[PDB]
Design a protein around this nucleic acid. Structure first.
Ligand code: MG
Ligand code: MG
Ligand code: MG
Ligand code: MG
Ligand code: MG
Ligand code: MG
Ligand code: MG
Ligand code: MG
Ligand code: MG
Ligand code: MG
Ligand code: MG
Ligand code: MG
Ligand code: MG
Ligand code: MG
Ligand code: MG
Ligand code: MG
Ligand code: MG
Ligand code: MG
Ligand code: MG
Ligand code: MG
Ligand code: MG
Ligand code: MG
Ligand code: MG
Ligand code: MG
Ligand code: MG
Ligand code: MG
Ligand code: MG
Ligand code: MG
Ligand code: MG
Ligand code: MG
Ligand code: MG
Ligand code: MG
Ligand code: MG
Ligand code: MG
Ligand code: MG
Lengths: 76, 61, 64, 50
RNA sequence: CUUUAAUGUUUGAUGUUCUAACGUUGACCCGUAAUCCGGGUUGCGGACAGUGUCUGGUGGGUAGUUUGACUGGGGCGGUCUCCUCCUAAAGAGUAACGGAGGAGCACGAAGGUUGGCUAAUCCUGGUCGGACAUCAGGAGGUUAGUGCAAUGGCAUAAGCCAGCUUGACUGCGAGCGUGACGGCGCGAGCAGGUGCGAAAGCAGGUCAUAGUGAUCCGGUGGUUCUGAAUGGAAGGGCCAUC
RNA sequence: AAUUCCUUGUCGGGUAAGUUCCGACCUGCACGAAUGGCGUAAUGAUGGCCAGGCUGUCUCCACCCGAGACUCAGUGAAAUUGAACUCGCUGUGAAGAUGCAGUGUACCCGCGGCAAGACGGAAAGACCCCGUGAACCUUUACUAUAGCUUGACACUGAACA
RNA sequence: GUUUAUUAAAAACACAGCACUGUGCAAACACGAAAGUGGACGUAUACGGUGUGACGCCUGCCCGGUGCCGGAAGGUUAAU
RNA sequence: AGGACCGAACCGACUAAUGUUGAAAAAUUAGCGGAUGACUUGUGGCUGGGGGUGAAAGGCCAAUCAAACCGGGAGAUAGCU
């Protein structure tokens, strides 16, 4: 029906893989929904961007009875 | 008389299209093309007509 | 002949201590209501011409 | 489109104002809200709203 | 006030008479044996005509120019910024006139918080009433719903309802995302002051990603920052805004 | 149809046979009344068609007289041209080969002839596209402007209605 | 009759004729910043512009658009 | 009598062949139209470049013309070769 439009790519996904040491503030994941969820010392921002509330190493877990991924930051 | 009827249809056909040229609803390309299908249609309808005529002409002769 | 200054870039960058230039942020002149306070508030301070642009600014302001 | 811009303007001394929009069509009643007037540096009433 | 009429005051316009500016491409006189020109006399017009300055209209008669680009040559059609998905090769990004859809808004609640609630679809019954209108029960278990495209999320609900309310808050911001850049986004936390909450606490708009327009030029409000001798003022700057 | 796209429309005539022609039909894609319509005697180096006479236009070319062409003597150019020791084929290859591979064939050099190739010579393609090129031309493109036109003021006065 | 000197001589241009229109004379109109001059030493049986193109028979319908010719109560509107 | 008829000079230029590094930067040859007219020709005059003149072809204005020629602005500009 007349195609050929697209939108500019919003540069998503993980920014810091597990084990990476981050400074309090940094953005560990960009995402539209909460693909990942904030765990300990990780804030989820208002676009679901997850960030660090604390300097430490990045920690990915799957916790929960619903079996969901969480990103935390362990102190290093 | 028959070819004449056929042809009159050639004529409205092209008329319709011809007219969809302004109100630029058709590419000048589109337009040539189609008018050609109409030619194809017209020649076809005719050759039929002449098959028929020939069939009969056989009888009479 | 004295190089003439780009009279208009001189009206928009002011040369700074260490050598860069400071400029005002675009996007704070109208269509203002529709913009966040965060946003606008951050475009209030001035800013330093980028690594990529000095080239062009120095080019314009030979007497800065 | 349709939605008019409006200022709400400190009820305190100051000429200071916040800025927003309203649906003039279905909501003609002068808007009115406590907002922070950073001049008097207090939280005052803010009126006007075409 | 209506509408009206009339003497008057104001201001316009229209007409007629005059002669003396002005016109005479009527006549005659001299310069002059000259169809020019000048002066004179006369007749005819006569403050008109015409000309200068200013002004509105008309003005291809003339003049300078403009009349985009992508493109499976060009043209024709279509497209141009933004958002979602696929192509995209399990980080990011990634082309085509590749396949599909949407935006140029909406909402002072459709925002904030505190408390509370939980869809669809089918079976069974029973008013109209049906394959689905409301009601009961069971199954089901989020397929529902989310202001709107698609993707990602959502039960701790981000879905639904109420009370109180203005955090759709002002200054800032460690730190990080993403961009050639202009920019854009995310952000704990700090100070001021707030709303809800017994309280832990949450709130710098809205489940998120579209809903946009640089600079210049001005306009509006505020601030003695500047102010061409000085005091003011205009104008300029600064902050908010159009 | 100087107009008809389908179209060599259909019918008639002319011909052995006629996409043209003539005469008709109306289905006029898209005639039509001073951007004139329909006719029209004459005229026309005007367009189309027919026929008699004529004929080397042709079947199909023959002989002949003359100017060249050819030989000798005198004079004496030209375009062109990277360099040449400058063959055919089939293949290859910036894709149509004297020049590469393979192979065939060819003793060295003139002269008269012919034009198939040297993408042969000549002109920095005229078509085509591009350049934010040029120039003329058009117009209800933009913007100005001479001309024309409107008012005010000035040269410009006196009475009156 | 004319025409593309040098690829077009024609069906194109011109033509007599026809019509529309302007022009009262210091004419319209044209060359001229102007003075002047042509129009014309003419004067509407004249002169310019435009279309048509001998002659014959003729020349229908439509004035909304666009011109032009008039009118004008109203609306809007320049310098001042 | 006649923009009347045939036809030389004269004026034209319809067809063909030759020519095309020509005899010639438009011709020769054989044919062709006009030929008392809106005819043709000598001398001189006048009209000038956005201008002239044009029985109109965008023709002609010194071998040229959708704006002559010469000198100047001038080394215009050339994102092209
Ligand atoms: Mg501002
Ligand atoms: Mg022009
Ligand atoms: Mg293009
Ligand atoms: Mg990827
Ligand atoms: Mg990959
Ligand atoms: Mg909601
Ligand atoms: Mg709750
Ligand atoms: Mg039931
Ligand atoms: Mg002063
Ligand atoms: Mg002062
Ligand atoms: Mg016929
Ligand atoms: Mg008529
Ligand atoms: Mg005629
Ligand atoms: Mg010799
Ligand atoms: Mg060979
Ligand atoms: Mg080969
Ligand atoms: Mg030889
Ligand atoms: Mg030869
Ligand atoms: Mg060649
Ligand atoms: Mg070339
Ligand atoms: Mg060329
Ligand atoms: Mg003749
Ligand atoms: Mg010629
Ligand atoms: Mg006349
Ligand atoms: Mg005619
Ligand atoms: Mg004669
Ligand atoms: Mg000729
Ligand atoms: Mg001859
Ligand atoms: Mg004769
Ligand atoms: Mg002479
Ligand atoms: Mg022409
Ligand atoms: Mg010449
Ligand atoms: Mg020119
Ligand atoms: Mg210069
Ligand atoms: Mg040069």
């Amino acid at each position: 029906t007349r195609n050929g439009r697209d939108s500019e790519a919003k540069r998503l996904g993980v920014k810091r893989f597990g084990g990476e040491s981050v400074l309090a503030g940094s953005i560990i994941v960009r995402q539209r929904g909460t693909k990942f969820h904030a765990g300990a010392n990780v804030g989820c921002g208002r676009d679901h961007t997850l960030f660090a509330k604390a300097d430490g190493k990045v920690k990915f877990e799957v916790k929960g009875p619903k079996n969901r991924k969480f990103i935390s930051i362990e102190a290093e | 008389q028959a070819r004449v009827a056929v042809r009159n249809v050639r004529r409205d056909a092209n008329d319709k299209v011809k007219a969809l040229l302004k109100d630029k609803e058709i590419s000048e390309d589109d337009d040539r093309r189609s008018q050609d299908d109409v030619q194809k249609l017209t020649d076809a309808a005719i050759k039929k007509i002449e098959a028929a005529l020939a069939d009969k002409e056989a009888e009479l002769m | 002949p004295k190089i003439k200054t780009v009279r208009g870039a001189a009206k928009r960058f002011k040369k700074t201590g260490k050598g860069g230039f400071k400029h005002k942020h675009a996007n704070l002149r109208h269509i203002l209501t529709k913009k966040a306070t965060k946003r606008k508030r951050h475009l209030r301070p001035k800013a330093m011409v980028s690594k990529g642009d000095l080239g062009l600014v120095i080019a314009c302001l030979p007497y800065a | 489109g349709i939605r008019e811009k409006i200022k709400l303007v400190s009820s305190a001394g100051t000429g200071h104002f916040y800025t927003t929009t309203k649906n003039k069509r279905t909501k003609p009643e002068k808007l009115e809200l406590k907002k922070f007037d950073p001049v008097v540096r207090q939280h005052v009433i803010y009126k006007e709203a075409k």
